[PDB]
Design a protein around this ligand. Structure first.
Ligand SMILES: O=c1ccn([C@@H]2O[C@H](COP(=O)(O)OP(=O)(O)O[C@H]3O[C@H](CO)[C@@H](O)[C@H](O)[C@H]3O)[C@@H](O)[C@H]2O)c(=O)[nH]1
Ligand SMILES: O=c1ccn([C@@H]2O[C@H](COP(=O)(O)OP(=O)(O)O[C@H]3O[C@H](CO)[C@@H](O)[C@H](O)[C@H]3O)[C@@H](O)[C@H]2O)c(=O)[nH]1
Lengths: 431, 431
């Protein structure tokens, strides 16, 4: 409608930040001003795409670091973890308020894992939107992203996981948040009843093919489509990668990507050896994007054969159309990239919403959820994913449906259509 | 001579071990009352133990958790109100019993919630007893927060801290009202309760649940408390003929029974079991308890090699079969391990996931992730023919048979009694 200053706020990893870059670029092209508010590590990434950056604390790697490496006695580790956690929350609260209160955004869009947005927008009296890539609103259709059961349960169970999560999350931070609300933001104390979080317009930046809206979604909870960044333009592929791909094809071998993102594992070399053995057993060429290790870190430890190339990060929109299947961790964005390219997809989930997407790929018939990762289960899965016609057709159909979605345009329309509602929701919390 | 109150809520598996312990205490010259739901009166009294009724039967809550598609804001209000009424009835009935009976010592399953408060009001020694991981430790995750696959010790420890906080804060409003209005105490919180001080009896074998070096000296893994009903059981003719037929035909004989569960499609599950049993070419004693709603199909159709029987005492039946497939309930797992059976576990809820992993880890059985005709057929083949697994099951039988859980628990009670008194008094208001 007219030129607004957006603040787009998120914490987490690349997959929390990249969709906001895509949305930010789209908003800039609609005439608006955009600041992405996230961790220092992502400044160059954000600025390389023409978006303004502001730093906040709240980097979850800091918390993961204490769960892996702290090896003091039990109660000491717990005290040290609680204190680090409390200090990390405090820094997130204080840095996010300092940015927002200085910049005077017209509109704030936030991932709700960042916690601060509903309070900050109340203090500044501005429209507020949530956006996220995993189930996070009350519904019977899907369990909460962090409480996915081993196998599907009924709708009341799913609904109750959301109620439990919202209560655990709030009550875990409510002491610190209410102190900050009172001492710093100038507000009164709040609780779940006053926050009415389920009133806030919510943008699920995922395809409705994988995450269809549920019969019980509110009107302002919208599944927009993935917010794809499109980095194939400007990517200059290194020679080794081009030669490897051409060699696979010249030799008539199937070509697979394997990559589990960043993870910490018990035995790095054993995992690598099981992947190598699996790739040898299934007669395949493998583009490997290793990010596992015993400590946070330093990639390839053992002698890899001719049919395996350890490459860094390569933009998936360039690579995925050229391979026959992909094996990955089921991260929301990575799943979007494999589905967008019509790849049969093997997922080995490790944490959180990866379990959600692993089940969804199996349910939609486009891939296989690995329970156990070893040389045999992966070799079987690689055989099915590179030869099963039904699965390839289902992956093709999903590719077709995703190509007709335009998640960014849908999300921007949703913002314009919901702006006045979003303002009204904020103002209802003002006393 | 002491007057023991043994207090528990839940199902038969929560009550049966206390019967066994109660009989042992009576033979040591003590008095025993078991305090649980009306449904178990006949069971308790048939074994010569005194019974007192309390409310708090989790079946009442299961209704709302396990219905399909009712959940929404209004249903959640009705569910909260029902939950609050259920808690209140448990609180009031348990206080009425304990305050009238004046036990010298209370031993409680901590899922019952009330014991730590009641013993503080009456100033008596308090013990906990339970059959799944419930004390802070790095060695095991909390029973209700078992990860998909093993994580590190810091992760395990933190699941216990999270669980303790969630459980307490879920009930603390109502418990504190009752503490003040009814018990005559002040309000409390997790910090004041110091729950990890309380002497704790894990009534499970240390072969399946070995103590960790980080277990406090008052946390004891005693061995299972077995009831032993084989000598009174008169097998019906159909069962005898079936057992004799399996053996005369040289077929392996398996028990399959998942207890009481609510599933999405009852007939499909039954058909997958039938197909699996045919493929493995075994004879199956089936104890069906699954249905689409809590209303009763122990009935089902079945071929000659499958016999639907009711409940049969497992200490009679498990010695007569070659393997067992079950849900991994703590008591049922103890019965299959005690009998030296290779054990297939398909977990559904809670601590079943803990025991499923433990049987796989000690090499006596297989954990099913997915239950279908193929996974079960493969598992039934391994469980009835793998020599290594049968040997390992025999060795575990030997280790269990050398434990005397009852005698160990009674000694632990006498050895920790003064400490148990002291822990209660530290919570008590100094006059
Ligand atoms: O070599 C690479 C690696 C990644 N990507 C892209 O980068 C994004 C990664 O997204 P995602 O898989 O969502 O991010 P991760 O940071 O890898 O995953 C974490 O963050 C996600 C969003 O919070 C969660 O879904 C995951 O469970 C969590 O592990 C996607 O667009 C990928 O296609 C590439 O183009 N090339
Ligand atoms: O036909 C039968 C059925 C049961 N039993 C015995 O009854 C007890 C049942 O114990 P358990 O499996 O502990 O009880 P359930 O009530 O089936 O299981 C619930 O309660 C347990 C203890 O709280 C939890 O470990 C389980 O996860 C939960 O499902 C065991 O000793 C069995 O051997 C028999 O002898 N014959």
């Amino acid at each position: 409608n007219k030129s607004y200053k957006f603040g787009l706020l998120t914490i987490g990893s690349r997959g929390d930040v990249q969709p906001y870059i895509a949305l930010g670029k789209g908003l800039i092209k609609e005439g608006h001003q955009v600041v992405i508010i996230t961790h220092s590590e992502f400044r160059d990434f954000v600025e390389s795409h023409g978006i303004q950056f502001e730093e906040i604390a709240g980097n979850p790697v800091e918390l993961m670091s204490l769960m892996v490496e702290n090896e003091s006695m039990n109660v000491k580790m717990l005290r040290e973890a609680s204190s680090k956690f409390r200090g990390w929350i405090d820094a997130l609260l204080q840095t996010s308020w300092e940015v927002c209160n200085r910049r005077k955004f017209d509109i704030l869009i936030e991932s709700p894992s960042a916690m601060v947005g509903i309070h900050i927008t109340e203090a500044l009296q501005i429209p507020y939107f949530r956006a996220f890539t995993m189930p996070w609103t009350r519904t019977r259709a899907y369990p909460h992203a962090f409480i996915v059961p081993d196998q599907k349960r009924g709708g009341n169970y799913n609904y109750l996981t959301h109620v439990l999560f919202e209560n655990v999350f709030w009550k875990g931070i409510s002491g610190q948040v209410n102190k900050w609300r009172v001492e710093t933001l100038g507000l009164g104390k709040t609780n779940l009843f006053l926050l009415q979080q389920n009133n806030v317009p919510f943008l699920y930046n995922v395809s409705p093919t994988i995450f269809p809206p549920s019969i019980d979604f509110s009107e302002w909870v919208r599944v927009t489509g993935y917010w794809f960044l499109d980095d194939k333009s400007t990517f200059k592929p290194p020679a080794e990668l081009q030669e490897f791909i051409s060699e696979a094809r010249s030799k008539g071998k199937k070509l697979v990507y394997i990559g589990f993102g960043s993870i910490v594992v018990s035995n790095a070399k054993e995992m690598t050896e099981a992947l190598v053995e699996a790739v040898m057993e299934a007669d395949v060429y493998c583009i490997l994007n290793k990010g596992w290790s015993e400590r946070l870190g330093k990639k390839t430890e053992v002698d890899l054969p001719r049919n395996i190339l350890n490459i860094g990060n390569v933009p998936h929109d360039w690579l995925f159309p050229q391979v026959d299947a992909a094996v990955h961790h089921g991260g929301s964005g990575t799943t979007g990239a494999s589905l967008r390219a019509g790849l049969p997809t093997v997922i080995k989930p490790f944490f959180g919403d990866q379990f959600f997407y692993a089940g969804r790929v199996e349910d939609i018939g486009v891939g296989i959820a690995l329970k156990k990762l070893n040389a045999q289960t992966l070799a079987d899965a690689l055989k099915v994913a590179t030869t099963n016609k039904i699965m390839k057709d289902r992956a093709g159909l999903i590719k077709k449906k995703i190509s007709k979605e335009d998640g960014i345009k849908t999300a921007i329309s949703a913002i314009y259509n919901e702006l006045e509602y979003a303002r009204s929701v904020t103002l209802s919390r003002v006393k």
